[PDB]
């Protein structure tokens, strides 16, 4: 069918609970994962813990951070490519750091015998005494020639249980003991006539310029992995255009093979809630004069007649790239927004204040600024709220959440851990994509009276409305929908709170 996929992790060297909790979360993240959209971080895995589930990973789009593991073997046996769409510490797409025990014994085997290409970024190896055979690897074939200056690798093993490379291995290079662990060369060993990866020394062995790690044939369908866009069974620099110009006709002609661009894939159609451009790409936002509106049930981008209405960027992009939460510093940049182009984060740190980012505490009054928001193109994450308020008053006018981006790649609405009594989202009418999670709101009472299915636009959307105030408690305290509105639920105790 198609590649299994997981989200990846950007925790670096942070530990997620105990070594046990940490390991579990890791496994839950990468069990049966084939492509990692983000970063593959393997940290704090202890001796004898089985890491077999890593064998299925074939490519990592971000970086690979293998650090602080005492486990002996990390079997990334099928990892073919690390794209480096994001770097660890601003320079490395692969960082192996400090995998040793107090006894000085830790990571010993790292048999990445298919890691044959790293698109961007350099590599760093440091403080791995137990490691075996990785020093024998020629990274000139794997790492791009633009990042060879930045690489910083040194291997010093005094535990010394390591074996020699199989004689078959070329230039004494191998990832392990057997011949199958001999390094495969697919770039430096090429004929002068191969622009890209090659299968061997001869000129007929060249690969198509779009093959990434190598190939099993000369065509673009023979690539081990694609360098840019995957179109069905083929690698392609650009997604084939919807329409091709015709010299004889002198007019545009439709292309049957034409497709739309979505992530690293060429697809027959864009997801309903994504913007489809005239030129044929699925995008999250409109650019420059272009503004967003759907011509025929499909979101289209058309240039503003005049100067465009202000765009309010979401927390986590633009000027708020590394902002953790709407806070005292940034909230005034949301003053009269009618639509958020991105996501919204509200965290407890906002109301405490954060000295580390130089953020003072947010005056809850300021949150009223958000009452002008009617739309959110991404997701909405609320993990804190003014404790004295009983409902999400500032989002009383929120109508649509489109879920183009999603928290942990799954949730478009996430309200957790509040002392509120009612959500209060009277105007909410559509949640185009992404799941919903309301849990941990010990005092919330009305959330299960709504039929969330009416709000959904994409197949698969589901809810997790659990672990708030129990229904028995709510009913006993008089906290159920008003009598006037008795059919479809309510966002609160009052008549206005009720649906339709």
């Amino acid at each position: 069918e198609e590649k299994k996929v997981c989200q990846g992790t950007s925790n670096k060297l942070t530990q997620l609970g105990t070594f046990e909790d940490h390991f579990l979360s890791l496994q839950r993240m990468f069990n049966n994962c084939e492509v990692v959209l983000g970063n593959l971080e393997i940290t704090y895995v202890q001796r004898n813990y089985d890491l077999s589930f890593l064998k299925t990973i074939q490519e990592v789009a971000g970086y690979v951070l293998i650090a602080l593991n005492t486990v002996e073997r990390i079997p990334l046996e099928n990892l073919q490519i690390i794209r480096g769409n994001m770097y660890y510490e601003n320079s490395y797409a692969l960082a192996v750091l400090s995998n040793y025990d107090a006894n000085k014994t830790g990571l010993k085997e790292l048999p990445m015998r298919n890691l044959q290409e790293i698109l961007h970024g350099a590599v760093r190896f440091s403080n791995n005494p137990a490691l075996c055979n990785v020093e024998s690897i020629q990274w000139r074939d794997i790492v791009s020639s633009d990042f060879l200056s930045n690489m910083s690798m040194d291997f010093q093993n005094h535990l010394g249980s390591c074996q020699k490379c199989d004689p078959s291995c070329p230039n004494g290079s191998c990832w392990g003991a057997g011949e199958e662990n001999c390094q495969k060369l697919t770039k430096i060993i090429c004929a002068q006539q191969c622009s890209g990866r090659c299968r061997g020394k001869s000129p007929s062995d060249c690969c198509h310029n779009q093959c990434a790690a190598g190939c099993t044939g000369p065509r673009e369908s023979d690539c081990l992995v694609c360098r840019k866009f995957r179109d069905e069974a083929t690698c392609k620099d650009t997604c084939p255009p919807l329409m091709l110009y015709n010299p004889t006709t002198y007019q545009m002609d439709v292309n049957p093979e034409g497709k739309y661009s979505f992530g690293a894939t060429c697809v027959k159609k864009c997801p309903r809630n994504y913007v489809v451009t005239d030129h044929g790409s699925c995008v999250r936002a409109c650019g420059a004069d272009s503004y967003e509106m759907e011509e025929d049930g499909v979101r289209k981008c058309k240039k503003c007649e005049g100067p465009c209405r202000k765009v309010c960027n979401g927390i986590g992009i633009g000027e708020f790239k590394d902002s953790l939460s709407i806070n005292a510093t940034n909230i005034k940049h949301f003053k009269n927004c009618t639509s958020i182009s991105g996501d919204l984060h509200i965290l407890p740190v906002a109301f405490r204040g954060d000295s580390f980012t130089h953020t003072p505490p947010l005056d809850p009054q300021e949150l009223d600024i958000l009452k002008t928001v009617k739309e959110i193109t991404g997701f909405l994450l609320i993990q804190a709220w003014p404790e004295n308020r009983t409902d999400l008053h500032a989002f009383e006018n929120l109508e649509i959440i489109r879920g183009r981006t999603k928290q942990h790649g799954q949730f478009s609405l996430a309200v957790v851990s509040l002392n509120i009594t009612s959500l209060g989202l009277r105007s909410l009418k559509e949640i185009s994509d992404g799941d919903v999670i309301i849990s941990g709101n010990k005092n919330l009472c009305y959330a299960n009276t709504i039929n969330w299915k009416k709000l959904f636009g994409t197949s698969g959307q589901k809810t997790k409305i659990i672990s708030n105030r129990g229904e028995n408690s709510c009913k006993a305290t008089g906290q159920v929908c008003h009598a006037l509105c008795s059919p479809e639920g309510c966002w609160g105790p009052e008549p206005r709170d009720c649906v339709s």
Binding site: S10, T14, S98
Partner: protein, 47 residues
Amino acid sequence: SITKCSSDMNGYCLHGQCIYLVDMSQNYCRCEVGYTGVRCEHFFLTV
């Protein structure tokens, strides 16, 4: 390997405990179960 952070970093981790890694010589966190992110900022959301 891991050593107690200084007290001046008390509020750096938002749902966890600051930890100090001697080799990296930079601060990180041990997150309370259920949370994630470098600063343990995010409730990990499950099915």
